[PDB]
Amino acid sequence: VHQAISPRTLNAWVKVVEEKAFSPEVIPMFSALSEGATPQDLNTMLNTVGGHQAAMQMLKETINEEAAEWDRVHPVHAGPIAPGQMREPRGSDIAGTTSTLQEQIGWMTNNPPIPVGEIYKRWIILGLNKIVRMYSPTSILDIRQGPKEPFRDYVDRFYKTLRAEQASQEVKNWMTETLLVQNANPDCKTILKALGPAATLEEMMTACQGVGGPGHKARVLAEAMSQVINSATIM
Amino acid sequence: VHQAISPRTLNAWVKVVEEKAFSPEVIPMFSALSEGATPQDLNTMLNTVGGHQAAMQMLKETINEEAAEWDRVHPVHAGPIAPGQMREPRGSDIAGTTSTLQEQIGWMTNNPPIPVGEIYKRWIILGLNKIVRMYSPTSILDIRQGPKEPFRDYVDRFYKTLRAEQASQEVKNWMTETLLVQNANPDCKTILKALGPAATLEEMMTACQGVGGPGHKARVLAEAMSQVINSATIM
Amino acid sequence: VHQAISPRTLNAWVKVVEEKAFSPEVIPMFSALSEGATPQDLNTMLNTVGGHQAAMQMLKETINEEAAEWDRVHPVHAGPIAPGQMREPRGSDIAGTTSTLQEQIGWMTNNPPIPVGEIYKRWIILGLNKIVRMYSPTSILDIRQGPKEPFRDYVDRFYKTLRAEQASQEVKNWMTETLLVQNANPDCKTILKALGPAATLEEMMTACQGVGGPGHKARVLAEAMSQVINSATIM
Amino acid sequence: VHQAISPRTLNAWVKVVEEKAFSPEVIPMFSALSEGATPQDLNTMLNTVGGHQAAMQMLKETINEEAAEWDRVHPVHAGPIAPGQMREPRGSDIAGTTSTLQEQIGWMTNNPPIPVGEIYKRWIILGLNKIVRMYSPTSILDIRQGPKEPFRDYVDRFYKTLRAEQASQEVKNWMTETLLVQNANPDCKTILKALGPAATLEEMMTACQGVGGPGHKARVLAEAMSQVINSATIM
């Protein structure tokens, strides 16, 4: 006993990860909470992050790569001593893939003092740093209509990423009412907004379903043509 | 071993509690995740909720009250048998105040099968139901200016509750830009909005700092007076 | 056995208490259902009432006061007889605070016939009578706007007490549609009702948010001023 | 010996706390300076912060609450071994309330290695994080006059918080000369500023002592009335 991370600490960690979508100050809080911990608990803190799976790709990858390098530097020669402190850890197992919590303690407490946990900490910090450089948070605020994009697909992507937005209900609702219409292209906006704000996604879709199409194109063009053409001429 | 709640389950539970600010469907998910658990783990699931401390008042209170009633129904007579299955649980301890995890198991596994955990579950469900009836979620959307309220205090309350809003950074920023100005009273709005949208909280505060005051009152009134007075008369 | 109140009787009792919010005829039905019962069951019938906690203050208080008076009249001298019918009941315990169901029967059946249950009945009846005099039922129908009261607070109190109203869903809905608007002050009513009935609590709030404020005041006054001023004069 | 924090480290810590009124980057510097320390020294670092006592409320509170939870998880069973490593620490004493520096070392150095100091560190970090979310620094810059507020009280609050401002003398003086007058309401500003900048707080107070009062109100209103009334009429 007297080794085990408390659930409120893990909850604070997941709180910091959601509340900040990859800001550089994560490392302080991480090293602070994950203090003197054991590697197994460290994997616990890692896969418990929810969403943002994109970066987990790079994180997990830099982890295995450092593991490989520790392998390349460290030899497996050992023996033939009778079983005791069976071996040296291995880059495969310092991350806790092929080892038990038992072996991790039997490494930490036993002498020499091999701080495998600290080493795992070091690698993961390296990784998080590299992540902080190589990421870009996506928001609901960024989703914008392409210039030539069927409006229906636009809403479908809008909602697709909105469901992942981390907020309460009524927030999302009012978002759906203001930003979705606000962020469209001028072509479909000048028709979605002529139709008053009152009418639901169904009426909106049926209104702008024509954009990009030949009929609507011909009309818009013709209109612009005669808009300036008849300004200073007759017959 | 083979008794202990997994951290991802607790994380899902805190997720459901944040994601929904007291909707009636909490009970299903709660009873589902908290299945056959032990009471100690149940207190773990309870105090780990973050924020929304208002309801914890009523929840904790109905808990102790049911405990009292179980006391009033159940007698403490026992003995003088030698120590074994020392007693019956007590409404004080079924909730795990004066008992250890050890006694909870020594009650659950030992025969007769006293399902203390289930009873604690029953009480807490009762409580959550009563909560669902007696609560009202607060939002950022609701914060509105009183009719006679110094604008500065209005912003101070706005921010005060906003910091508790559960969203990412840029969300909050753009909220601060649209809703804060949008939700003011007509009197200070017709001055905050005459000053163009560009200018920061400092300029806004210095602009509406006069509302409610004698100078501004006299002016507004006078203006309204002569607005209609000079409409159909002269000299 | 052959002592225990049946659950449908208790259900009928809670039915009579909800269905009538403190009418004087409660005593008949109470004495009828609670016939020859035991005190423990009587406390069961008491704290099971739901809501209307206001009166429970006075009820519980008159109970402890009669208990005190029974103490003041009855002496605790007894002994040194060997244990049997250990003592006399006590005003602390006739109400069943420090006694078990066992002692209550060992008092009722044993001779002399001490009708402790009846005495508890007598006190509680006294109490309910005093309550019938000192209460006033609150309804949804009574909630009315103060003369100078921010409309938003008015709705907040409206809903606050409505959630406690004892009716089904659609009842409450249609109530919310008719009474809430119907019961406002003339000042905010003459603006809430100019805006057609169709528009939701949001539009209503934003409409009357100005009442009581300096702008709206100046306007209303000015208007009334010139309404009569220009009736019989010019220039 | 070879355990004791050096005074310049503590001085740097108080420097970082004053110099930054609750920015999120406190945690790095705190964990850095408070490295491997002992809990007693940690309480030393805590109560030595000066001013900003508001947050100490929340900090101290979250500390005792984590202590309670460690209690709820950890049992007090121990014995009957003869005195040696007398017990396990307790959530009451890990924070060093009922323990001596001696017991803290006899816990740290003795085996098993119980890192009580680290655990205290973990809790306090959790706390500081929660503080960073739940605080708002007050400045001298924020103090502003309410819209209807006796000017004299305005200056009294101004000075009241200014004496706590953390700067040298002449800074405060020139502040008192510029900001105090600059931040008043339009009504009293248009009189304080008509009286030239030269005259001291006494003359200023006697000048604006009339604001909000009936005389001054009547005058201001009348003035505004005839300001527009006589603009386009005569007789």
Q: Residue C215 is nearest to which of B75, B220, B227, comparing CB atoms?
A: B220
Q: Residue A48 is nearest to which of B11, B19, B48, comparing CB atoms?
A: B11
Cross-chain Cβ contact D147/B218 below 8 Å? no
User: Which chain B residue lies closest to A20 (C-alpha atoms)?
Assistant: B168
User: Which chain B residue lies closest to C157 (C-alpha atoms)?
Assistant: B136
Q: What is the dihedral of CA B54, B60, B63, B68, to 10 degrees?
A: -120
Phi and psi at residue C76, to the nearest 5°: -90, 0
- Which residues are CB-contacts of C163 (< 8 A; sequence separation ≥ 6)? B133, B134, B136
Q: What is the dihedral of CA A142, A145, A147, A149, to 10 degrees?
A: 140
Say whether A94 sits in a helix, a strand or coil.
helix
For residues C103 and C83, is the Cβ–Cβ distance under 8 A?
A: no
Q: What is the dihedral of CA A178, A180, A181, A182, to 10 degrees?
A: 70
Experimental approach: cryo-EM
User: Which chain B residue lies closest to A11 (C-alpha atoms)?
Assistant: B11
Cross-chain Cβ contact A12/D113 below 8 Å? no
D interface with B, Cβ–Cβ < 8 A, is 69, 72-73, 75, 77, 133-134, 136, 144-148, 185-187, 190, 211-212, 216-217, 220-221, 223-225, 227-229, 232-235
Burial class (CB in 10 A: 0-12, 13-18, 19+), B35: exposed
Which residue type does C111 have?
A: N
Phi and psi at residue C204, to the nearest 5°: -60, -50
Phi and psi at residue C163, to the nearest 5°: -60, -25
Q: How far apart are CA D74 and CA D209, in angstroms?
A: 64
Structure tokens at B37: 């658990």
Buried b (16+ CB within 10 A) or exposed e, B116-144: bbebbbebbeebbebbeeeeeeeebbebb
Q: Which residue has the tokens 């997720």?
A: B15
Structure tokens at A44: 């616990």
For residues B151 and B129, is the Cβ–Cβ distance under 8 A?
A: no
Give the number of other CB atoms < 10 A from CB of residue A111: 6
Give the number of other CB atoms < 10 A from CB of residue D88: 17
CA distances from C131 to C26, C29, C51, C96, C166 (A): 11, 16, 15, 22, 21
Which residue type does C124 have?
A: I
Structure tokens at A218: 């011909």
Q: How far apart are CA D62 and CA D64, in angstroms?
A: 6
Q: How far apart are CA A138 and CA C222, in angstroms?
A: 54
Q: Which residue has the tokens 């001593």?
A: A81
- Which residues are CB-contacts of C143 (< 8 A; sequence separation ≥ 6)? C157, C158, C161, C162, C183
Cross-chain Cβ contact A35/D66 below 8 Å? no
Closest of B94, B42, B41 to residue B68, by C-alpha:
B94
Closest of A97, A147, D118, B15 to residue B30, by C-alpha:
B15
Q: How far apart are CA C86 and CA C198, in angstroms?
A: 73
Which residue type does B57 have?
A: Q
Say whether C178 sits in a helix, a strand or coil.
helix
CA atoms within 13 A on the CB side of A107: 23
Q: How far apart are CA C96 and CA C107, in angstroms?
A: 12
Question: ∠ CA D154-D158-D163 to the nearest 5 degrees?
Answer: 155
Q: How far apart are CA D173 and CA B121, in angstroms?
A: 64
Q: How far apart are CA C135 and CA C58, in angstroms?
A: 10
Cross-chain Cβ contact C96/B185 below 8 Å? no
Is the omega angle on the peptide bond into residue B83 within 30 degrees of 0, that is, cis? no
Q: How far is CA C113 from the centre of its chain?
A: 37
Cross-chain Cβ contact D28/A28 below 8 Å? yes
The alpha-helical segments, DSSP class H, found in C5-52 are 7-19, 26-33, 39-47
Which chains touch D (3+ CB pairs under 8 A)? A, B
Q: End-to-end CA distance of chain D: give it in Å, rounded.
A: 97
Q: How far is CA C33 from the centre of its chain?
A: 21
Q: How far apart are CA C174 and CA C176, in angstroms?
A: 5
D5 phi-psi bin (left φ>0, alpha ψ -120 to 50, beta other): beta
CB pairs under 8 A between B and C: 81
Buried b (16+ CB within 10 A) or exposed e, B70-80: bebeeeeeeee
Sign of CA dihedral B199, B205, B208, B214: negative
Q: How far apart are CA D148 and CA D150, in angstroms?
A: 7
Closest of A192, A34, A21 to residue A122, by C-alpha:
A34
Cross-chain Cβ contact B226/D224 below 8 Å? no
Cross-chain Cβ contact B186/C218 below 8 Å? no
Burial class (CB in 10 A: 0-12, 13-18, 19+), A1: exposed
For residues A161 and A173, is the Cβ–Cβ distance under 8 A?
A: no
- Which residues are CB-contacts of C61 (< 8 A; sequence separation ≥ 6)? none
Q: Residue A29 is nearest to which of D70, D113, D129, comparing CB atoms?
A: D129
Q: Best interface-test mutation with B: which of D145, D191, D221 has the largest number of B CBs within 10 A?
A: D221
Is the omega angle on the peptide bond into residue B112 within 30 degrees of 0, that is, cis? yes
Cross-chain Cβ contact D187/B214 below 8 Å? yes
Q: How far apart are CA B5 and CA B100, in angstroms?
A: 17
Is the omega angle on the peptide bond into residue A112 within 30 degrees of 0, that is, cis? yes
Which chains touch C (3+ CB pairs under 8 A)? B
Q: How far apart are CA B211 and CA B217, in angstroms?
A: 7
C122: part of which helix (H) or strand (E)? helix C116-134
Q: How far apart are CA A96 and CA B58, in angstroms?
A: 44
Give the number of other CB atoms < 10 A from CB of residue C38: 21
Structure tokens at B61: 């209170």
Q: How far apart are CA B224 and CA C216, in angstroms?
A: 10
Q: Residue C218 is nearest to which of B220, B232, B235, comparing CB atoms?
A: B220
- Which residues are CB-contacts of B191 (< 8 A; sequence separation ≥ 6)? B207, B208, B211
Chain gaps in chain B, named by the residue before each (C–N > 2.5 Å): none
Structure tokens at C110: 């044993």
Cross-chain Cβ contact B50/A11 below 8 Å? yes
- Which residues are CB-contacts of C145 (< 8 A; sequence separation ≥ 6)? C151, C154, C183, C184, C185, C188
Q: How far apart are CA C215 and CA B216, in angstroms?
A: 10
Q: How far apart are CA B96 and CA B106, in angstroms?
A: 13
Cross-chain Cβ contact A12/D114 below 8 Å? no
Say whether A233 sits in a helix, a strand or coil.
coil
Q: How far apart are CA A107 and CA A87, in angstroms?
A: 10
Closest of C44, C152, C30 to residue C95, by C-alpha:
C44
CA distances from A6 to A118, B98, C112, D72 (A): 19, 21, 61, 12
- Which residues are CB-contacts of D206 (< 8 A; sequence separation ≥ 6)? none
Which residue type does D110 have?
A: N
Structure tokens at D157: 């609050």
Q: How far apart are CA A94 and CA A117, in angstroms?
A: 8
Is the omega angle on the peptide bond into residue C112 within 30 degrees of 0, that is, cis? yes
Q: Which residue has the tokens 């600059």?
A: D182
For residues B222 and D227, is the Cβ–Cβ distance under 8 A?
A: yes
* DSSP labels, chain B: ---PPPHHHHHHHHHHHHHSSS-TTHHHHHHHHS-S--HHHHHHHHHT--S-HHHHHHHHHHHHHHHHHHHHHS------SPSSS-S---HHHHTTSS--HHHHHHHHTSSS---HHHHHHHHHHHHHHHHHHH-----STT----SS--HHHHHHHHHHHHTT--S-HHHHHHHHHHHHHHTS-HHHHHHHTTS-TTS-HHHHHHHHTTTTSHHHHHHHHHHHHHHHHTTS---
Structure tokens at A119: 């080493």
Structure tokens at B153: 């205090």
Buried b (16+ CB within 10 A) or exposed e, A97-106: eebeeebbee
Q: Best interface-test mutation with B: which of D148, D181, D192, D193 has the largest number of B CBs within 10 A?
A: D148
Q: How far apart are CA D158 and CA D144, in angstroms?
A: 8
For residues B34 and B121, is the Cβ–Cβ distance under 8 A?
A: yes
Task: State how far residue B144 is from chain D, nearest Cα, in angstroms.
Answer: 19
Question: ∠ CA D63-D64-D66 to the nearest 5 degrees?
Answer: 70
Say whether C66 sits in a helix, a strand or coil.
helix
- Which residues are CB-contacts of C217 (< 8 A; sequence separation ≥ 6)? B221
Q: How far apart are CA D201 and CA D140, in angstroms?
A: 18
For residues B112 and B89, is the Cβ–Cβ distance under 8 A?
A: no
Give the number of other CB atoms < 10 A from CB of residue C167: 10
Beta strands in chain A (DSSP E): none
Q: How far apart are CA C71 and CA B112, in angstroms?
A: 42
For residues A201 and A184, is the Cβ–Cβ distance under 8 A?
A: no
Burial class (CB in 10 A: 0-12, 13-18, 19+), D35: exposed
Q: What percentage of chain D's residues is helix, strand, coil (to nearest 5)? A: 60, 0, 40
Q: End-to-end CA distance of chain A: give it in Å, rounded.
A: 97
User: Which chain D residue lies closest to B217 (C-alpha atoms)?
Assistant: D221
Q: Residue A10 is nearest to which of B7, B15, B141, comparing CB atoms?
A: B7
Give the number of other CB atoms < 10 A from CB of residue C208: 23
B interface with D, Cβ–Cβ < 8 A, is 40, 43, 47, 96, 100-102, 150, 152, 159-160, 163, 205, 209-219, 221-223, 225-226, 229-230, 234-235
Contacts of A174 in chain B (CB under 8 A): 141
- Which residues are CB-contacts of D193 (< 8 A; sequence separation ≥ 6)? D181
CB pairs under 8 A between A and B: 61
For residues B176 and B143, is the Cβ–Cβ distance under 8 A?
A: no
Cross-chain Cβ contact C214/B232 below 8 Å? no
C121: part of which helix (H) or strand (E)? helix C116-134
Cross-chain Cβ contact D73/A35 below 8 Å? no
Q: Which residue has the tokens 């007894």?
A: C78
Structure tokens at A52: 């943002």
Q: How far apart are CA D95 and CA D124, in angstroms?
A: 10
Q: How far apart are CA B103 and CA B111, in angstroms?
A: 13
A132 phi-psi bin (left φ>0, alpha ψ -120 to 50, beta other): alpha
Say whether D75 sits in a helix, a strand or coil.
coil
Q: How far apart are CA C103 and CA B103, in angstroms?
A: 30
Structure tokens at D73: 């998880």
User: Which chain D residue lies closest to B202 (C-alpha atoms)?
Assistant: D142
Task: State how far residue B124 is from chain C, nearest Cα, in angstroms.
Answer: 17
